[PDB]
Structures are given as C-alpha cells and as structure tokens.
Amino acid sequence: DLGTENLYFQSMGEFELIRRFFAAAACAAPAADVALGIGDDCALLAPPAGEQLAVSTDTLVEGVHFPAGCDPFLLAQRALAVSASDLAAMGAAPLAFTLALTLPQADAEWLQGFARGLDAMARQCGLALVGGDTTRGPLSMTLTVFGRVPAGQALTRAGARPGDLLCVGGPLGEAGAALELVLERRSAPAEVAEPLLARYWTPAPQFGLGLALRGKASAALDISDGLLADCGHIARASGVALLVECQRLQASAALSGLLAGEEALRQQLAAGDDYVLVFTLPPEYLGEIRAAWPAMAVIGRVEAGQGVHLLDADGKELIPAAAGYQH
Amino acid sequence: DLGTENLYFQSMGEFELIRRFFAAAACAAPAADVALGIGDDCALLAPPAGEQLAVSTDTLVEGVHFPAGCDPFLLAQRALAVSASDLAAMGAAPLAFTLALTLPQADAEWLQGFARGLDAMARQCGLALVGGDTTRGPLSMTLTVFGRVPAGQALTRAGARPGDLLCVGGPLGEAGAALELVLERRSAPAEVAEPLLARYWTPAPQFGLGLALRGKASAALDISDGLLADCGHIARASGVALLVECQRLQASAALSGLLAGEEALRQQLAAGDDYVLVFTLPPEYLGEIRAAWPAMAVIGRVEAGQGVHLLDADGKELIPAAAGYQH
Ligand SMILES: Nc1ncnc2c1ncn2[C@@H]1O[C@H](COP(=O)(O)OP(=O)(O)NP(=O)(O)O)[C@@H](O)[C@H]1O
Ligand SMILES: Nc1ncnc2c1ncn2[C@@H]1O[C@H](COP(=O)(O)OP(=O)(O)NP(=O)(O)O)[C@@H](O)[C@H]1O
Ligand SMILES: [Mg+2]
Ligand SMILES: [Mg+2]
Ligand SMILES: [Mg+2]
Ligand SMILES: [Mg+2]
Ligand SMILES: [Mg+2]
Ligand SMILES: [Mg+2]
Numbered sequence: 096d097l098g099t100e101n102l103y104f105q106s107m108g109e110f111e112l113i114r115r116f117f118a119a120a121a122c123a124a125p126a127a128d129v130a131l132g133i134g135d136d137c138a139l140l141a142p143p144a145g146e147q148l149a150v151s152t153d154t155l156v157e158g159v160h161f162p163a164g165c166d167p168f169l170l171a172q173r174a175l176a177v178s179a180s181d182l183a184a185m186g187a188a189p190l191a192f193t194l195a196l197t198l199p200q201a202d203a204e205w206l207q208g209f210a211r212g213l214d215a216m217a218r219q220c221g222l223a224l225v226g227g228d229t230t231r232g233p234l235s236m237t238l239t240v241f242g243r244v245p246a247g248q249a250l251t252r253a254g255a256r257p258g259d260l261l262c263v264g265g266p267l268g269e270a271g272a273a274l275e276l277v278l279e280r281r282s283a284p285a286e287v288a289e290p291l292l293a294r295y296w297t298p299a300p301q302f303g304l305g306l307a308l309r310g311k312a313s314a315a316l317d318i319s320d321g322l323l324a325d326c327g328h329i330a331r332a333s334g335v336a337l338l339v340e341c342q343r344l345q346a347s348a349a350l351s352g353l354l355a356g357e358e359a360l361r362q363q364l365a366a367g368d369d370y371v372l373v374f375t376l377p378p379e380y381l382g383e384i385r386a387a388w389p390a391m392a393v394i395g396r397v398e399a400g401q402g403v404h405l406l407d408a409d410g411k412e413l414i415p416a417a418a419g420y421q422h
Numbered sequence: 423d424l425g426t427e428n429l430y431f432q433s434m435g436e437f438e439l440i441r442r443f444f445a446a447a448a449c450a451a452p453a454a455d456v457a458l459g460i461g462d463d464c465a466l467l468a469p470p471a472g473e474q475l476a477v478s479t480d481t482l483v484e485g486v487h488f489p490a491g492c493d494p495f496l497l498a499q500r501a502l503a504v505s506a507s508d509l510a511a512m513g514a515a516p517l518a519f520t521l522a523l524t525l526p527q528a529d530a531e532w533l534q535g536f537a538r539g540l541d542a543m544a545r546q547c548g549l550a551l552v553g554g555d556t557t558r559g560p561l562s563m564t565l566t567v568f569g570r571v572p573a574g575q576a577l578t579r580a581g582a583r584p585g586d587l588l589c590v591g592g593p594l595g596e597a598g599a600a601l602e603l604v605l606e607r608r609s610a611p612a613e614v615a616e617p618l619l620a621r622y623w624t625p626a627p628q629f630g631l632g633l634a635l636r637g638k639a640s641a642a643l644d645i646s647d648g649l650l651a652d653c654g655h656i657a658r659a660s661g662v663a664l665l666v667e668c669q670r671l672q673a674s675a676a677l678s679g680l681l682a683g684e685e686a687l688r689q690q691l692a693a694g695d696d697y698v699l700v701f702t703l704p705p706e707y708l709g710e711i712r713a714a715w716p717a718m719a720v721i722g723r724v725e726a727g728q729g730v731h732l733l734d735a736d737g738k739e740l741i742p743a744a745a746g747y748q749h
C-alpha cells in the first residue's frame with residue numbers, strides 16, 4: 096500500500112461524536128433479553144416465551160417538562176424515571192429503552208453529565224439502553240421504554256369495580272411542592288429541600304408495586320397529571336365512580352416541611368408528576384399489598400356510578416367554585 | 423340524583439382533543455400481534471413465539487428533516503416511511519409503531535391532514551399505531567417502529583465478506599434531486615417532478631427486499647445519509663473494504679429527467695434520504711434476489727482491506743479534491 100487514495104470526511108462528524116456518549120454509556124452494556132443493543136438499524140429484544148412486550152413513549156420538551164439550563168445529570172434521571180413509570184403502571188418488569196435526543200449542537204460537558212445521570216437511573220431501573228436517535232434542533236428528548244409481562248397479567252385502566260378499595264402507592268403532591276423550590280419561588284432548609292427535590296428530579300418508578308399488583312389490582316395507572324385527573328381514567332375506562340376521601344390524604348413529613356393545610360392538599364390533589372400508582376383493589380388483597388408495599392395508602396373506594404368524587408370528613412362532595420378552578 | 427356535585431375541567435383539555443386525532447385514526451384499529459393498542463399506559467405486543475422484536479426510533483425536526491409549513495398529509499407519510507425503513511434494514515416484518523408528537527398548539531386542519539397521511543403510509547407499511555405521546559413545543563415527531571424477525575435471521579451490518587457482491591435495492595439520488603424541487607431551486611414538468619417528489623415525501627420502505635435477504639445477505643442497512651457514507655458502516659462493522667464501481671451507478675429515468683452527468687452522480691453518491699437498502703451478497707444468491715427484487719443492482723464488490731473505495735471505469739480510485747469536498 097502507498098498510503099494514498101482513502102475516503103474520509105464524508106460522514107462520522109459532529110453528531111457521531113455526540114452519539115458516542117451513549118454508545119459508550121454504562122447502561123448500553125449487554126443485558127438479559129437483549130439480543131442486539133446499540134449499533135445496528137434496530138435493537139433486537141427477546142422476552143422469554145409467553146411474555147409480552149409492554150411499550151411506552153414519553154417526550155420531555157425544554158421549558159415545558161423541565162427548566163431551561165438545568166443540571167443535565169438531574170435531567171437525564173428525571174427523563175428516564177418519568178418514562179419508566181409507565182412500565183410500573185402496567186406491572187411490567189423493566190427491560191430496555193431507546194433515547195431520541197434532539198439538541199442544538201454538541202456540548203461536551205452537558206453530554207457527559209447527561210450520560211452519567213442516564214447511567215445512574217438506568218441502573219436503578221434495571222433498564223438497558225439499546226438504541227436511539229441523535230438529531231439537531233431545540234432541546235427535546237423522547238424515551239421509549241420496554242418491559243415484559245406474562246400474557247393476561249398486565250395491569251389495565253379498566254376493571255375497577257364497585258366495592259373495590261381506591262389506593263395510592265405513596266405520598267402525593269411532593270413533586271408539586273418541589274417545583275416551588277426548583278423555580279426558587281420558595282426557600283427551605285436542606286432537611287426539607289432535599290427530600291422534595293429528589294421527588295422532582297429522581298422519582299423512583301414503582302416497579303415493585305406494579306409487580307406485586309399482578310392478578311390482584313382490578314385497575315391501575317401511574318399519577319402523572321394529578322390525583323383527581325388520573326382517577327378519571329380508571330373511572331371512565333371501568334365505567335364506575337371513584338370516591339376520594341379528603342381526610343385520607345395524609346401530607347407527608349417532606350410535604351408538610353414546606354407547605355401546610357390547603358396549599359398542601361391542593362398539591363396532593365392536582366400537582367401531578369407524582370409517578371406513584373393509583374389503583375383499585377378488591378378488599379381481600381389489602382393486607383398482602385400493604386406488606387409488599389408499606390408506603391401504599393387507602394384513599395377511598397369504588398362504587399356504581401360515574402365520575403371522580405372528592406368527599407370531605409362528613410361525606411359531602413367538594414366542588415371547585417367555578418369551572419377551571421381547583422380545590 | 424339531583425344533577426349537581428360533578429367534577430369537571432380538571433383534565434381532558436386541549437391536548438386530549440389533539441390526541442383523539444390519533445386514537446380515532448384508521449391505523450389505530452386492532453391488528454395481529456397487538457394484544458393492547460392505544461388507551462393504556464403501555465401498548466402490549468405479542469410476536470408469535472420464537473420471533474424477536476426489532477425496535478428503531480427516529481426523530482424529524484421542523485426545518486431540519488422537513489421544511490416548515492409543508493403539507494401535513496405528505497409530512498406524516500414521510501415521517502413514518504423513513505422510520506419504518508429501519509425495519510426493512512433488519513429484514514423484520516412490520517408490526518406496529520408509536521408516535522410522539524410535539525406541536526405548539528392545536529391546529530385542526532393540520533392534524534386532520536397529518537392523521538390522514540399517517541393512515542395511508544401505515545396501511546401501505548402494514549403498521550398499527552399502538553401508542554404515543556402528545557406534547558407542547560416546537561414542532562417535532564419521534565416515531566418508534568416495531569417489527570418481528572426469527573431469532574438469528576436479522577440482517578446486521580457486520581458479516582460482509584471479501585468476494586461478496588455489493589448491491590443496492592433501487593435507484594439512488596432521487597430524493598436529493600427531489601429536494602431541489604421541494605425548495606423550488608429548480609423547476610420541472612409533472613412527468614419529472616411527480617416521480618421524484620414521491621421519493622422525498624413517500625419513499626417506500628423496502629420490506630420485501632429485507633425479507634428476501636434473510637439468511638442470504640451477509641450484511642445490510644438502509645441508505646439514509648448517503649451511499650458512500652452508509653457503505654462505511656458495513657465496511658467498519660465487517661472489517662472489510664467495499665468497492666463501488668462508479669460505472670455501475672445508473673441514473674434513473676426520473677433522476678435523468680432533472681439532472682445530468684456529474685450533478686446526478688453526486689446525488690447518487692451523497693444525497694441520502696434514499697431509503698433503499700445497501701447490502702453485501704454471496705454471489706450464489708444473485709439470481710434469486712434479482713428475481714425477488716428486480717430493482718436491485720450490483721454496484722461493486724467486497725475485498726479484504728479497509729474503507730469505502732469509489733472506482734472509475736479504469737479501476738482507479740476517485741478522491742475528493744480536499745477534505746470536506748464531495749465528488
Ligand atoms: N442518542 C442515542 N442513544 C442511543 N443509541 C443511539 C442514539 N443515537 C443513535 N443511536 C444508535 O446508534 C446507531 C446509529 O444510529 P444513527 O447514528 O442515528 O444512524 P443514522 O446515520 O443517523 N440513520 P437514521 O437516524 O436512522 O436516519 C443505532 O444503533 C441507533 O439506535
Ligand atoms: N400522538 C399519539 N399517538 C398515538 N397514541 C397516543 C398519542 N398521544 C398519546 N397516545 C396514547 O394515548 C394514551 C394516553 O396517553 P397520554 O394522553 O400521553 O397520557 P398522559 O396523561 O399525557 N400521561 P404521560 O404522557 O405518560 O406523562 C396512551 O395509550 C398513549 O400511548
Ligand atoms: Mg438505518
Ligand atoms: Mg408516560
Ligand atoms: Mg440518526
Ligand atoms: Mg402513565
Ligand atoms: Mg432511522
Ligand atoms: Mg402525554
């Protein structure tokens with residue numbers, strides 16, 4: 096060979112170098128049920144026979160689902176956790192995900208921090224990064240998550256039945272409170288700020304609860320938009336009434352650390368971004384689910400009828416004063 | 423019942439009404455191997471036993487992968503087709519997809535046209551729409567496509583071997599030529615404009631070729647960035663040299679209709695957006711693949727070595743005059 100006549104500078108440019116932050120990420124390593132990870136036109140998933148693949152996609156847009164200029168290490172954890180919460184909402188076991196990242200141009204420090212946070216949440220969630228896309232534009236990420244669940248055992252939003260208990264998998268309103276700190280509308284000491292901020296940036300997807308509920312919950316989903324709003328999805332898909340007992344909404348120590356009374360209750364009822372499951376449960380399974388997931392709480396019940404109903408201590412229904420208002 | 427004490431205006435707002443364009447789309451109908459489509463936290467896919475799920479994601483950003491203000495009916499077809507091309511690149515049979523759509527606000531006429539075009543391409547591709555996400559922000563779409571392929575039979579980018587033929591599945595450069603028309607940098611009569619524009623807005627994913635190549639091609643991918651660039655992925659993953667014979671790049675009737683000589687050859691070599699497969703093939707399978715896919719063409723060969731090599735009629739290597747230039 097003479098050392099000449101080689102073709103270069105046709106490809107493998109800036110966005111290839113960006114892509115390599117993810118090809119080299121710890122969460123891109125080989126993993127169970129992944130026959131082919133990053134590097135080809137598709138990833139290949141191989142859930143053990145009899146198991147279906149649960150698939151969900153979520154998009155986070157800069158300025159909409161997270162603040163501009165935020166720590167990329169926290170942002171990557173938040174993006175993966177909120178997306179992975181939908182697998183828990185089905186009772187699926189975590190398997191893998193793809194990352195479609197759009198960004199204006201390379202930023203090496205941003206990407207290093209983003210990839211490091213993605214590794215941490217992925218390890219926490221047991222999710223392999225198996226593919227993705229890297230594109231130029233205003234900052235955005237679309238994560239598509241994959242889990243496995245035996246046929247017929249997925250948790251669905253229909254099936255809530257009158258007589259069932261209405262339950263949640265953990266404290267509500269904490270991410271809404273945390274947003275007050277994130278936006279610096281309020282201050283707090285570390286003992287208050289740290290637990291709440293962890294709920295905004297690193298909500299733990301409730302995989303264990305979803306798995307515990309297989310064959311037991313009559314219906315479930317994860318609270319992303321707000322307690323009362325997401326109860327409406329069960330009520331409508333199941334054709335029943337969901338009753339929420341306002342007295343059973345215990346504000347957490349962390350929530351009470353920053354907010355009190357009505358402000359706290361409003362966060363519980365309507366903040367969303369909780370990524371805690373809401374589920375309906377035949378009463379015969381209460382003890383088991385309490386043992387499997389002690390953070391769970393009964394907040395109400397299911398009856399024949401329509402709609403979501405917030406009840407005060409005397410059983411009377413609470414209605415916002417005007418259309419569009421909240422409690 | 424008294425008709426009072428009902429909770430509304432907490433949810434089911436503007437972006438729910440946007441979402442319904444897709445929940446009601448024809449391509450959201452029940453489909454084979456889809457155990458659960460739109461409506462729950464995850465879709466559930468059930469490929470028949472022994473078959474793996476091939477998964478790919480692609481993002482199209484307004485102004486980057488399509489022009490601002492373009493026909494949404496054409497845009498939805500383009501978005502789904504370019505994403506579905508990665509299933510053909512694996513030899514997967516099409517199954518389903520999710521649509522993550524980001525848009526500034528509702529636009530009823532845009533959405534009606536977008537959903538109508540998505541139905542057409544989905545029917546053409548045999549893809550069920552099973553889930554997605556709808557978010558506010560600068561216009562963008564991330565499509566995640568799912569196909570099925572028997573274990574061990576997927577087409578991969580490694581495995582090209584010296585002695586193999588280098589082939590493509592159809593004419594090259596047509597979408598690059600079409601872009602001249604899309605941007606109105608050139609004019610053409612309908613007999614020229616219509617075939618080229620169809621390649622930009624409605625490239626047909628080469629599912630049949632990918633399926634025909636199972637167990638026969640030694641390596642393959644789809645040309646998205648450009649002939650020479652994407653040949654480099656096979657060369658590097660397989661550890662071989664790919665030789666492209668410049669004389670074997672026949673400009674199509676449609677391509678020749680608008681451009682001639684070098685301008686046409688440059689489109690063939692570097693336009694990308696072809697969404698035609700490039701593949702390496704043991705010579706013993708040439709006749710079969712020609713019969714299965716008559717648009718296919720031999721363009722070169724594989725040898726021991728490194729890199730991609732463009733050769734002229736005398737076998738001498740063509741090199742751009744300076745780094746960054748193209749032929
Ligand atoms: N951000 C990312 N995270 C993880 N994997 C990625 C990412 N971007 C790309 N990939 C993977 O890297 C490989 C190359 O993808 P990519 O670089 O997007 O190809 P491409 O030339 O851009 N063609 P296309 O994106 O399909 O139009 C594939 O296996 C992808 O799944
Ligand atoms: N553009 C879309 N195309 C197809 N299906 C969609 C689309 N947007 C949402 N879906 C589906 O519609 C159902 C409701 O999703 P969605 O309205 O996004 O829930 P959400 O309240 O916004 N929670 P989340 O998106 O997970 O934070 C699910 O089954 C989704 O997969
Ligand atoms: Mg490809
Ligand atoms: Mg979601
Ligand atoms: Mg790409
Ligand atoms: Mg959900
Ligand atoms: Mg692609
Ligand atoms: Mg949504």
Ligand code: NA
Pocket residue numbers: 150151152153181462463464553554
């Ligand atoms: Na989802």
Ligand code: NA
Pocket residue numbers: 152153154555556
């Ligand atoms: Na979302």
Ligand code: NA
Pocket residue numbers: 135136137226227477478479480508
């Ligand atoms: Na892909």
Ligand code: NA
Pocket residue numbers: 228229479480481
């Ligand atoms: Na892409």
